[PDB]
Amino acid sequence: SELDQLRQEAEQLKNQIRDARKACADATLSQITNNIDPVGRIQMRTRRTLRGHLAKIYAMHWGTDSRLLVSASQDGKLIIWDSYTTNKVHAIPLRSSWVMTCAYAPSGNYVACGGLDNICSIYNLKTREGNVRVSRELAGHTGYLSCCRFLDDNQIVTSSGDTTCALWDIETGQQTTTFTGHTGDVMSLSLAPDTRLFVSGACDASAKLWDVREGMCRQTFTGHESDINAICFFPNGNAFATGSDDATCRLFDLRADQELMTYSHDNIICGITSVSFSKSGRLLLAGYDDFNCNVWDALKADRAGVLAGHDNRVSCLGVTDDGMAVATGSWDSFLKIWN
Amino acid sequence: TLSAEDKAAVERSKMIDRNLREDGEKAAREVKLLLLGAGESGKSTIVKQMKITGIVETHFTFKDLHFKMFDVGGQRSERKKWIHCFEGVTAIIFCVALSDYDLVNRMHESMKLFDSICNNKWFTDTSIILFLNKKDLFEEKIKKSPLTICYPEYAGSNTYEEAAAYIQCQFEDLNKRKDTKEIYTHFTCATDTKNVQFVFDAVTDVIIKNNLKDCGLF
């Protein structure tokens, strides 16, 4: 048969890739960062509590000014909060209640949310009529959206449960690039700091490094034995971290093209819903569904701190661009902002 | 302190809170029914009987009660990733075609779906309203074809009533916690106006249990 020898060539390529990438594995990141002093106990207290949602929050996102944050919950509301004065700047009602992602534009003029309606809706915040209205609805993406993320005011990358990611042009409304190659549902997405490449973590327990320009998978990463729910670049743009339902986070580097560190603990048997790094990337903040967050020392895999202020599943978290705050939304309708 | 603009910002935020409480108490006084079941099982018959591209929402009013049915089966993905979004529905309207037993092991696939939904961790106490559809088709089909090719351990008369009660007994016995949740089995005709009445009567028990949970009495 021709398909059987073609699968033979595929597994031979996979064996050559695994041998070529263990040939560049000489020393673990534990063996390099064992002389490094640890960060000690990270004590972060809850500085704000944002209380306006009346249902489970699935998504927050910070602004680039580190003061405004958008928040999405199942009551059909996304609220834009002033994080300093605890005020509500905007309350935007959603055309579908089932919303599992939200993003805030890096200019700040737009928010965009999506869910089970299969549509990333984009809302113009800064209108001469004074209200927030829908600018575009990006239809045609045939699965629930898991994560949409802005590049500009005109470009946005969506991930979905039809195993695809996409690059859209907002003003024309039609998607310009489709990133295919996962076999499970793409659950999370994270853009690089230069935004010329991104990572997608999916339900086939593999994270793929995409490339926004030509539109195809540059590197592929395995190592999780369960479905990946969270993904986040390192601030250098060279590493990234995955979080999944086998209770481990994992660190991958793009140039070494392999696993470096597993953030696991035998007390933790629960899933991971959200990860983020700090500003220097020394702290990896993973939100779990044993109702709290852990702050891992990302170079030594100690568990440096526990953010334990929620009475349901931590579903989303985000660190500011300043690094001055961490917000943590959850399924008990409360954002907590920690410092 | 607060300047003259921060006071108006706080006043705007308070008025936004009043609109949020109004909308939240408007949506809290409403019944949310998750419509489920395998494909070609008369869910279209159900949504034309209550009222007359990922998730289809239907709003109807019956006896001073507002119902929202969510037909989520139009979109296909891994169900475990989005099934927690419907934790907190009032009832799960499951639909099973009775006359889809001799076609292809489709009744075994709908039993697989009922075992997945009914023993789920998110619907561990959510009541299920089970609608057995196409019962006139089941009546005209059970004379020529036997129920042995769907259920090999079935021993009984090949009439409507004993085999339909057997299919009920099989579907009732998929749950592992009979004491925790209720299953309300009904049979739809080709056309009858009593299915929304059955939904309303099963929802009234869930409303009574939620009112007792609201008053601390559980």
Epitope: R67, L68, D82, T85, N87, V89, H90, R128, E129, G130, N131 | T1, S3, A4, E5, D6, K7, A8, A9, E11, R12, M15
Partner: single-chain antibody, 230 residues
Framework: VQLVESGGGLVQPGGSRKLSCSAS????????MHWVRQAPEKGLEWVAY????????YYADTVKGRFTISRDDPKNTLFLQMTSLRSEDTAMYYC??????????????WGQGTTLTVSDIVMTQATSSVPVTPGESVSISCRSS???????????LYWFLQRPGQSPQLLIY???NLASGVPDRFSGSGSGTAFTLTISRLEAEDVGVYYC?????????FGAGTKLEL
Amino acid sequence: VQLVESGGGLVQPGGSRKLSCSASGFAFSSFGMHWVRQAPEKGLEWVAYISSGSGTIYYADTVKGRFTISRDDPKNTLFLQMTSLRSEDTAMYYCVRSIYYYGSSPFDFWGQGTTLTVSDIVMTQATSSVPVTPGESVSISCRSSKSLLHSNGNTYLYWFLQRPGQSPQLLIYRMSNLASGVPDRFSGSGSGTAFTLTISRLEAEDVGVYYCMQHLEYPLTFGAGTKLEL
């Protein structure tokens, strides 16, 4: 976005008059309204303010007791009931929308004004007239009597331009931020009680009177008016 006012005319002193303003094309219930008047050859003088949803109503000390500002949101209309009018109430009355949240731009749209004819913190714009050549750069300063820098970091100074024969128009909100529809050739700077508006590379249709206003506390007070001429 359109605020058009009506209800002006001649009132015999001692009499009464209701001024009305109809709004068109913006979410009128989300906006606070101000009435700011202007005497026939004087500057702008703020009269009254009703909030969004009518929750907070302020007045000027010279009109307090005799004037009542009242909005009605389904008709999208604003009223000012004016009782026992004196001869210093002869003015042109302007309705102003202003919305207040983080990063907002209040006082951004002004109405066309009606002519009434009746038969704190001070702002000193020290220069009343500037001889201007087009193409050049013009700096316009004004003085406050109190530090306009609040503890939150905002220094609430507002620069308006009134082109001749028209309504005034927001150039800069909170001493440094350009309004929408305002070019980058306008810029503002300052410290507490000392501010300046610079116009680099001045062209025509910048001729007019420039007013600086405080929004630190009520009553809102304008400058006397710095006027450019070509």
